[PDB]
Design a protein around this ligand. Structure first.
Ligand SMILES: CCCCCCCCCCCCCCCCCC(=O)OC[C@H](COP(=O)([O-])OCC(O)COP(=O)([O-])OC[C@@H](COC(=O)CCCCCCCCCCCCCCCCC)OC(=O)CCCCCCCCCCCCCCCCC)OC(=O)CCCCCCCCCCCCCCCCC
Ligand SMILES: CCCCCCCCCCCCCCCCCC(=O)OC[C@H](COP(=O)([O-])OCC(O)COP(=O)([O-])OC[C@@H](COC(=O)CCCCCCCCCCCCCCCCC)OC(=O)CCCCCCCCCCCCCCCCC)OC(=O)CCCCCCCCCCCCCCCCC
Ligand code: HEA
Ligand code: HEA
Ligand SMILES: CCCCC/C=C/C/C=C/C/C=C/C/C=C\CCCC(=O)O[C@H](COC(=O)CCCCCCCCCCCCCCCCC)COP(=O)(O)OCCN
Ligand SMILES: CCCCCC/C=C\CCCCCCCCCC(=O)O[C@H](COC(=O)CCCCCCCCCCCCCCC)COP(=O)(O)OC[C@@H](O)CO
Ligand SMILES: CCCCCCCCCCO[C@@H]1O[C@H](CO)[C@@H](O[C@H]2O[C@H](CO)[C@@H](O)[C@H](O)[C@H]2O)[C@H](O)[C@H]1O
Ligand SMILES: CCCCCCCCCCO[C@@H]1O[C@H](CO)[C@@H](O[C@H]2O[C@H](CO)[C@@H](O)[C@H](O)[C@H]2O)[C@H](O)[C@H]1O
Ligand SMILES: CCCCCCCCCCO[C@@H]1O[C@H](CO)[C@@H](O[C@H]2O[C@H](CO)[C@@H](O)[C@H](O)[C@H]2O)[C@H](O)[C@H]1O
Ligand SMILES: CCCCCCCCCCO[C@@H]1O[C@H](CO)[C@@H](O[C@H]2O[C@H](CO)[C@@H](O)[C@H](O)[C@H]2O)[C@H](O)[C@H]1O
Ligand SMILES: C[C@H](CCC(=O)O)[C@H]1CC[C@H]2[C@@H]3[C@H](O)C[C@@H]4C[C@H](O)CC[C@]4(C)[C@H]3C[C@H](O)[C@]12C
Ligand SMILES: C[C@H](CCC(=O)O)[C@H]1CC[C@H]2[C@@H]3[C@H](O)C[C@@H]4C[C@H](O)CC[C@]4(C)[C@H]3C[C@H](O)[C@]12C
Ligand SMILES: CCCCCCCCCCCCCCCCCCCC
Ligand code: CUA
Ligand SMILES: [Cu+2]
Ligand SMILES: [Mg+2]
Ligand code: NA
Ligand SMILES: [Zn+2]
Lengths: 49, 40, 227, 72, 513, 44, 102, 70, 143, 44, 56
């Protein structure tokens, strides 16, 4: 007799993965979090004095 | 280990209620305090 | 100072810090290798259906398990202790400077010749000049001659503090009633930053250290101008 | 029991000896001999020794034991 | 009946149950404290207030996790439940004194929570160093309430240690030598010896701090000829043994879990495992000043403490390799308890190795009072002591309760916790090497990325803690009653059924010579 | 004294919903306490 | 030596009046070793099952030979090959012949 | 007919083969790490200081306006 | 075969590949036809049918080796559910960012970071490997 | 000896084994240690 | 004095189901009630004192 994993495993794996990636990508990029990456190769230095 | 089947089975719906109530009991009071930090 | 996304030590400013980088590289290789070997052996023990569950004789294998680690510790201890004794070696300083920790700022005393002393406080975030570093700049930097052996003496007039400059390999506790000694020698001019490294109350996070390393002649004129 | 005392012999006592042996064999190098000073409280001679020339101590080491008149 | 049973207990199992409930509640407090820490550090700037409120939270976090969560669960909970059963004893030697060890902890905890409510709290660090902890820089009741909290927890564990040593020495079957007792029983006896010898020295030191604060003594006050560094020696004379106290019973539970889920009758190299635990216990008394490499001690003293500390890797290595040799050839059951134990072996090894880095005085100059130390101790505590507790809890819950956990949920719980603790602590190595100090409410801007990631990790660990409460609820809610347990021939604690009767071994075991 | 599953504990498991309430209050009060202590310290 | 180990195990299972307890003790002890038992040992264990009127234990013994081979798929078919004369003589069906490999 | 395969010590043989494999990889990693980390660092510091002019470094910093004292 | 709580002290049945011959038969009580089958087992096994042999196996044992050793889809549920709860955690972090965290300090503004970057290059922060080492002072650009 | 109809036996199969083998011995026919086969008989 | 241990042995072994802390008679109940009343009342007073000390 098929168990919970046989019936729902594929959907739990696919949905869980999709949901996890989507919400972490949104959190990481869309809500103003400051990661403060390296300026190297990214920032143009500007006169400060 | 072997065990008997559940004497009082917890259905998926019942588990969703228990998990929901558990999470809210942690999240609502802390959330109320942190939301109100400015006022404090 | 540290830079964003930094993984390792600040670049060495002093020969002893250079020595600590090479010693850390050697130790880290060993840590990587042992961690890796344990994870690999776990994965090896767990990936066969072959079994052997009868009693296993331990004594031969326990020789390997104790000797090889004993040898590895000796290979760490030897360079570890060479560096320990190298920092302790007699060097003849040209200059003595004192620092006193306070809640929540450093005072400096240069009293070889004249009575020069001043307080060194964090620049508030709202008073930073463009390009200056949050929580790291001070009003009055510790100006010192580059390429010279300096004796730093460290104490406190209240609670514990600790006077640290990572890029020079320095950390000396500031204890009331005690005068702790360390030596400082910068291979380079520049600005070298540190932060109070003993929990000392409300503004422990906000009493940093800034060394300004310049030629002797500049240090002399600065000293004279600070009396 | 004997089992316990054997456990202490091999698990604590001989490991201690092995570590002190390592400690000692790491500081076994010959130290720099100090300048000779003919101090009157040292190299005592009130009677010649009953062996050799009378002026050498029993386990005399030429490298580190000066005579009353200095290093050989 | 309820009062007689649960307030007046003289029963090792019920008292073990009280300890596990107490420890579980304490773990929720310590978790909340850990999230406030990581909320403060999760973005640059100030969230709560200055370093005082922050360090009250940090200080309370440590005391709760160590004194109210790990020690009560490992020693009071697993020790009381399992030790008598594993030696066929009818109870502890001092079943009424046992109950006072338990009932001292609620009051101890009440005094710690009082410290945090009065004045501005004890923002001292869990080390409580003077003069910050003295009556000038911490005027008022907070530090005294912390000292008294420690006194009651101290008495609890000293009387508990007398109870365990006596029970384990005196109450085995007469044919059973000490070399026929299970490794968990050894791990508790050795832990009890460490507690008996170390806690009285802590008691002396914090009593001196109490008299400096209230009776005009000057043990730690240079104005009277005292020395703040004397407090540090007395504290750490206790504090290094204390970390061995925190891990030893975890070592014992790991030996049982690895043996059990490898389908083995016995751990590899039993006498080596006994030797290793006794060696670690002894060496743990002669290394304390590795907590003091920056205070200004003499170079030869630093050389001695470096060397003596590194020696601990040898016996610890024998245990790690013996656990691997127990897995070797096993019929491996991938139970949730086995997952905790395998995570333990690996993550404990990593934290032990960062401890060997710190043992080097010269390198410790730059790592001391940095997040590198924080990374080391959370690998051994939050991924070592905690993984052994979680493994032991899921392994023995059916013995204690008579009910099974949902193994799928327990594996989910393991996976979430594994991700969260690594995301929390792995990046703290980088923060340490690059110079971020300990006990800071805020950091220079360069440290932002690793602090951000670490705080996100802490939230994943919170999700695992919430799920664990649900999983325990689901087990009691569903009532799946245990039927058969494998390997009872080498796991005596299971042989009286699940749960065992209130009175076991009324008729002792028969063991001949 | 009562022996057996659900009887060797100082709390009832006779009703899973009453148990959920009791567990919610027990673990919830422990987790809440530090947030309310911080609120208390901030409000002085 | 290998021949001495195998001879001890043949002798163990060949004891005419071996009892059920001894048959179990034997097989449960033998499967703890780092080996797949030689056909001559299995032959002697299967003839013990016959003396004990225990068909089911004979089938289980063939299963545990396969299991002890782990991923070495060549070992079980080799052992069955060597046992065919005994299986035919005693009327022992293999697990595969009984569908107990599904 | 099938050949008699090896039937004894298969777990011990797998262990021996892979511990030797682990030793060999361990030596491969140590050589790699010597070259990619340890020696790279010795050479970076040696190359930096070989022709380093501390007074010229100071003059650059001074002209950029970084110092209180110069 | 009903296993009872009150039976814990009696020899019990197990399916374990390392304990192939357990201490008791799976089925102890025999029907009339199961009794006749055990009598027939005392004669030549060649005279037993395939069905009778399977029936004798299933009286002695619960699961075959193939059944007790089978793989499951459980890993899908565990990994999927773990990813769901880790996803849920990001909701808590979104909530925290929106309702708890105020603005970050002005030193993270793009123009501040550009100026601070130049000042770090002017003071030659980490000039051997870490930072200024990655700046080309001759060409005025990152290497 | 027993005052009831079963008692736990621990069998130290060989001198100085660290592993004790535990089992219930029941009233009736002698039982054997499942490790060494040593016979034990209950005398209630 | 005279040896009256046998009379105390009879009293404390009497088959009356009392726990040892109450088996001496009515005086044990009184001293028990005094002890537990002072402990519980004292504990409630310590909580009141915390409430008071928790505010300025
Ligand atoms: C589940 C987990 C969830 C997530 C956990 C958190 C993730 C953290 C992300 C790390 C990625 C860092 C990054 O930006 O990489 C770019 C980075 C850019 O390289 P780079 O700028 O040339 O840096 C080389 C350094 O100079 C090299 O020199 P350094 O001096 O700059 O290097 C020191 C540094 C260097 O260390 C590392 O790079 C750590 C690598 C971790 C291995 C996994 O730090 C350490 O010492 C860390 C101490 C770790 C303690 C011991 C750990 C045991 C290892 C376990 C073995 C398992 C292996 C199988 O690339 C990497 O090296 C990858 C990391
Ligand atoms: C800073 C403080 C430190 C806090 C540490 C907290 C940890 C303490 C640990 C000890 C736990 C307490 C147990 C002993 C005394 C409790 C007295 C009481 O009232 O209990 C009622 C309550 C159960 O109520 P029930 O279900 O109505 O009673 C069933 C009885 O069979 C039926 O009995 P009955 O019908 O004869 O009478 C029962 C009746 C009345 O029973 C009596 O006659 C008792 C009268 C005197 C009781 C004095 C004890 C006070 C507790 C001491 C600690 C403070 O109980 C009630 O229903 C009303 C009582 C209300 C008082 C609630 C106190 C509970 C603990 C408080 C937690 C923390 C509070 C701090 C707040 C923080 C805010 C900033 O007992 C408990 O609190 C047990 C814990 C709650 C459930 C948690 C389950 C979690 C599962 C986790 C798994 C870990 C174990 C794994 C192994 C499992 C298999 C072995
Ligand atoms: C469970 C808790 C626990 C455990 C077990 C340990 C174990 C060890 N700890 Fe740690 N430690 C802490 C908890 C713990 N620690 C805490 C809480 C602090 C901070 C206190 C404070 O300031 O608040 C701390 C701080 C601390 C310091 C001070 C650092 C500083 O403040 O600057 C040092 C210094 O040596 C140290 C070292 C060690 C070492 C060498 C071990 C050893 O026991 C580790 C041994 C294990 C291994 C080495 C791994 C397994 C071995 C092998 C696989 C064999 C092969 C290995 C080799 C050849 C190396 N730790
Ligand atoms: C056992 C000890 C232990 C444990 C587990 C932890 C767990 C955690 N710790 Fe901490 N921590 C310390 C001991 C511990 N800590 C100590 C001693 C200090 C130094 C204090 C000082 O400087 O004075 C410290 C300091 C410290 C700092 C440094 C603060 C600073 O220097 O400013 C940080 C920063 O992130 C931190 C975070 C965390 C986090 C996020 C967790 C999370 O991993 C926690 C997650 C939750 C759990 C692990 C569950 C716990 C609950 C249970 C296990 C109950 C189980 C229930 C049953 C079995 C029924 N802790
Ligand atoms: C290796 C482990 C230890 C070995 C012990 C000794 C070995 C040889 C001698 C045996 C007897 C020892 C007993 C103690 C007596 C006196 C001196 C012994 C200590 C010794 O051996 O000292 C040596 C001198 O011996 C000297 O003079 C000369 C010594 C020889 C003559 C001794 C004559 C005196 C005898 C006195 C007897 C009295 C007995 C008492 C009886 C009591 C009854 C009531 C030291 O050598 P050194 O070159 O000065 O310094 C080293 C420089 N590199
Ligand atoms: C700042 C102020 C903080 C002070 C906090 C004070 C803390 C608690 C208050 C203490 C109240 C004590 C009440 C009396 C306790 C008596 C314990 C006792 O006497 O325990 C005995 C066992 O301990 C033994 O022998 C040997 C051990 C006897 C120990 C007696 C009590 C010691 C309590 C203080 C210990 C502190 C340690 C000092 C060293 C640092 C008896 O064991 P039971 O299980 O009862 O019986 C077993 C039956 O078979 C007996 O017939
Ligand atoms: C570290 C542990 C905590 C992690 C984060 C917890 C996640 C938060 C859970 C929800 O918490 C709630 O959030 C609401 C907002 O979403 C708050 O309502 C507040 O905001 C609402 C919307 O503005 C108003 O309607 C309410 O009156 C007001 O109390 C409410 O009090 C609070 O309990
Ligand atoms: C680092 C983890 C690696 C684990 C290494 C474990 C090695 C165990 C070897 C001991 O087992 C032996 O195996 C042999 C049969 O092969 C037996 O014949 C021998 O009697 C037995 O003692
Ligand atoms: C970042 C840390 C993440 C941790 C991730 C945890 C992964 C969860 C694994 C759950 O998946 C199941 O695991 C079982 C074991 O738990 C497997 O048993 C199967 O495979 C095993 C062979 O190794 C056998 O022992 C079993 O008999 C057999 O049924 C089963 O098929 C598999 O679906
Ligand atoms: C079994 C039940 C347990 C018994 C519980 C008893 C509780 C009642 C105690 C009475 O309370 C007292 O109140 C006094 C107020 O009059 C206080 O006096 C003290 O505080 C005064 C307040 O002004 C000062 O004058 C002095 O410090 C001093 O007299 C004193 O602290 C306190 O004890
Ligand atoms: C002698 C004692 C007990 C043996 C027994 O009676 O069973 C055993 C137990 C563990 C052993 C030790 C451990 O195996 C660790 C070490 C292993 C080395 O190969 C020898 C020294 C070493 C330190 C061993 C000496 C001795 O053989 C010990 C101490
Ligand atoms: C008379 C009485 C008999 C005791 C008895 O056998 O019951 C004696 C025996 C020993 C006596 C005690 C001891 O001789 C020691 C004490 C001597 C002092 O002179 C009187 C009090 C003193 C404390 C005595 C009191 C009393 O007289 C005792 C107790
Ligand atoms: C029961 C005692 C067994 C003694 C074992 C000795 C080996 C361990 C040595 C380390 C220190 C032990 C101190 C006692
Ligand atoms: Cu001054 Cu921290
Ligand atoms: Cu330590
Ligand atoms: Mg410090
Ligand atoms: Na902050
Ligand atoms: Zn036996």
């Amino acid at each position: 007799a098929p168990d919970f994993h046989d019936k729902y495993g594929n959907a739990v794996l696919a949905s869980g993965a999709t949901f996890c990636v989507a919400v972490w990508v949104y959190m990481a990029t869309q809500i103003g979090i400051e990661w403060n990456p390296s300026p190297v190769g990214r920032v143009t230095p500007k006169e400060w004095r | 280990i072997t065990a008997k089947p559940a004497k009082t089975p917890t259905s998926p719906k019942e588990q969703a209620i228990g998990l929901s109530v558990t999470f809210l009991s942690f999240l609502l009071p802390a959330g109320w305090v942190l939301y109100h930090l400015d006022n404090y | 100072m540290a830079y964003p996304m930094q993984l390792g030590f600040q670049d060495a400013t002093s020969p002893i810090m250079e020595e600590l980088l090479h010693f850390h590289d050697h130790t880290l290789m060993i840590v990587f290798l042992i961690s890796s070997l344990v994870l690999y052996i776990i994965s090896l023990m767990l990936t066969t259906k072959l079994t052997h569950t009868s009693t296993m004789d331990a004594q031969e294998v326990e020789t390997i398990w104790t000797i090889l680690p004993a040898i590895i510790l000796i290979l760490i201890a030897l360079p570890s202790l060479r560096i320990l004794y190298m920092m302790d070696e007699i060097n003849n300083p040209s200059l003595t400077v004192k620092t006193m920790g306070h809640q929540w700022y450093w005072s400096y005393e240069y009293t070889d010749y004249e009575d020069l002393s001043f307080d060194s406080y964090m620049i508030p975030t709202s008073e930073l000049k463009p390009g200056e570093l949050r929580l790291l700049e001070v009003d009055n930097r510790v100006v010192l001659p580059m390429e010279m052996t300096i004796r730093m003496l460290v104490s406190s007039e209240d609670v514990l503090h600790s006077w640290a400059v990572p890029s020079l390999g320095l950390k000396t506790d500031a204890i009331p009633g005690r005068l702790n000694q360390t030596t400082l020698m910068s291979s380079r001019p520049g600005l070298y930053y540190g932060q109070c490294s003993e929990i000392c109350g409300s503004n422990h996070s906000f009493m940093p250290i800034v060394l300004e390393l310049v030629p002797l002649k500049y240090f002399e004129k600065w000293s004279a101008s600070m009396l | 029991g004997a089992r316990t005392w054997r456990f202490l012999t091999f698990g604590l006592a001989l490991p201690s000896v092995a570590l002190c042996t390592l400690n000692s064999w790491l500081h076994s190098g010959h130290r720099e001999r100090p300048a000779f000073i003919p101090y009157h409280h040292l190299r005592i001679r009130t009677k010649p020794f009953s062996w050799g020339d009378g002026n050498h101590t029993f386990f005399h080491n030429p490298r580190v034991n000066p005579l009353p008149t200095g290093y050989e | 009946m309820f009062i007689n049973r649960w307030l007046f207990s003289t029963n090792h199992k019920d008292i073990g149950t009280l300890y596990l409930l107490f420890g579980a509640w304490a773990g929720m407090v310590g978790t909340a404290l850990s999230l406030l820490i990581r909320a403060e550090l999760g973005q640059p700037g100030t969230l709560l207030g200055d370093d005082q409120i922050y360090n009250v939270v940090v200080t309370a976090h440590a005391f709760v996790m160590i004194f109210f969560m790990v020690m009560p669960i490992m020693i009071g909970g697993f020790g009381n439940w399992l030790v008598p059963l594993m030696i066929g004893a009818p109870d502890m030697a001092f079943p009424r004194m046992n109950n006072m060890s338990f009932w001292l902890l609620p009051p101890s905890f009440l005094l710690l929570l009082a410290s945090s409510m009065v004045e501005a709290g004890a923002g001292t660090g869990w080390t409580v160093y003077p003069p910050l902890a003295g009556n000038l820089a911490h005027a008022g009741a907070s530090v005294d309430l912390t000292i008294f909290s420690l006194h009651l927890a101290g008495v609890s564990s000293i009387l508990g240690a007398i109870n365990f040593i006596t029970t384990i020495i005196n109450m085995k079957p007469p044919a059973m030598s000490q070399y026929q007792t299970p490794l968990f029983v050894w791990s508790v006896m050795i832990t009890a010896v460490l507690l008996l010898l170390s806690l009285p020295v802590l008691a002396a030191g914090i009593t001196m701090l109490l008299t400096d604060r209230n009776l005009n003594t000057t043990f730690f006050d240079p104005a009277g000829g005292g020395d703040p560094i004397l407090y540090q020696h007395l504290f750490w004379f206790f504090g290094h043994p204390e970390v061995y106290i925190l891990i030893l019973p975890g070592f014992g539970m790991i030996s049982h879990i690895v043996t059990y889920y490898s389908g083995k009758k016995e751990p590899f190299g039993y006498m080596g495992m006994v030797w290793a635990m006794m060696s670690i216990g002894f060496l743990g008394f002669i290394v304390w000043a590795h907590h003091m490499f920056t205070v200004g001690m003499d170079v030869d003293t630093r050389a001695y403490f470096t060397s003596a500390t590194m020696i601990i890797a040898i016996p610890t290595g024998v245990k790690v390799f013996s656990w691997l040799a127990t897995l070797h050839g096993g019929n491996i059951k991938w139970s949730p308890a086995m997952m905790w134990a395998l995570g333990f072996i690996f993550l404990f090894t990593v934290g032990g190795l960062t401890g060997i880095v710190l043992a080097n005085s010269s390198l410790d100059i730059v790592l001391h009072d940095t997040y590198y130390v924080v990374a080391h101790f959370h690998y051994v505590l939050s991924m070592g002591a905690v993984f052994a507790i979680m493994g032991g809890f899921v392994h023995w819950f059916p013995l204690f309760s008579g009910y099974t956990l949902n193994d799928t949920w327990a594996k989910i719980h393991f996976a979430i916790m594994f991700v969260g603790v690594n995301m929390t602590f792995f990046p703290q190595h980088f923060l340490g090497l690059s110079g971020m100090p300990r006990r800071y409410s805020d950091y220079p801007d360069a440290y932002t990325m690793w602090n951000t990631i670490s705080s996100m990790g802490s939230f994943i660990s919170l999700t695992a803690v919430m799920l664990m409460v649900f999983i325990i609820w689901e087990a009691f809610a569903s009532k799946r009653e245990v039927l058969t347990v494998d390997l009872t021939t080498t796991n005596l604690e299971w042989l009286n059924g699940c749960p065992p009767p209130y009175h076991t071994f009324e008729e002792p075991t028969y063991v001949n010579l | 004294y009562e022996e057996g599953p659900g009887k060797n504990i100082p709390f009832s498991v006779e009703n899973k919903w009453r148990l959920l309430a009791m567990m919610t209050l027990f673990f919830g009060s422990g987790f809440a306490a530090p947030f309310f202590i911080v609120r208390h310290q901030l409000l002085k | 030596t290998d021949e001495e180990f195998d001879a001890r195990w043949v002798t163990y299972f060949n004891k005419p009046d071996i009892d059920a307890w001894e048959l179990r003790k034997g097989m449960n002890t033998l499967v703890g070793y780092d080996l797949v038992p030689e056909p001559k040992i299995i032959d002697a264990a299967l003839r013990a099952c016959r003396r004990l009127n225990d068909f089911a234990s004979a089938v289980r013994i063939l299963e545990v030979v396969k299991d002890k081979a782990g991923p070495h798929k060549e070992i079980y078919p080799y052992v069955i090959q060597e046992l065919r004369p005994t299986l035919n003589e005693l009327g022992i069906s293999t697990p595969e012949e009984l569908g107990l490999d599904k | 007919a099938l050949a008699k395969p090896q039937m004894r010590g298969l777990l011990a043989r797998r262990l021996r083969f892979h511990i030797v494999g682990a030793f060999m990889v361990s030596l491969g990693f140590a050589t790699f790490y010597k070259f990619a980390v340890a020696e790279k660092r010795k050479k970076a510091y040696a190359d930096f200081y070989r022709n380093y002019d501390s007074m010229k470094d100071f003059e650059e910093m001074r002209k950029a306006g970084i110092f209180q004292s110069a | 075969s009903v296993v009872k709580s009150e039976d814990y002290a009696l020899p019990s049945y197990v399916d374990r590949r390392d304990y192939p011959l357990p201490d008791v038969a799976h089925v102890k009580n025999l029907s009339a036809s199961q009794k006749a089958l055990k009598e027939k087992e005392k004669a030549s096994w060649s005279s037993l049918s395939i069905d009778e042999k399977v029936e004798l196996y299933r009286l002695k044992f619960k699961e075959s080796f193939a059944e007790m050793n089978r793989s499951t889809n459980e890993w899908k549920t565990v990994v999927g559910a773990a990813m769901f709860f880790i996803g849920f955690t990001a909701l808590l972090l979104i909530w925290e960012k929106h309702y708890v965290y105020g603005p970050i300090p002005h030193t993270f503004e793009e123009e501040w970071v550009a100026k601070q970057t130049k000042r770090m290059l002017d003071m030659k922060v980490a000039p051997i490997q870490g930072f200024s080492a990655k700046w080309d002072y001759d060409k005025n650009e990152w290497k | 000896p027993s005052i009831t109809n079963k008692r736990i036996v621990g069998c130290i199969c060989e001198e100085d084994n660290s592993t004790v083998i535990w089992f219930w011995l029941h009233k009736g026919e002698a039982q054997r240690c499942p490790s060494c086969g040593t016979h034990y008989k209950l005398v209630p | 004095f005279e040896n009256r241990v046998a009379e105390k042995q009879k009293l404390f072994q009497e088959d009356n189901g009392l726990p040892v802390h109450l088996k001496g008679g009515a005086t044990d109940n009184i001293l028990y009630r005094v002890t537990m009343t002072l402990c519980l009342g004292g504990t409630l007073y310590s909580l009141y004192c915390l409430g008071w000390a928790s505010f300025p």
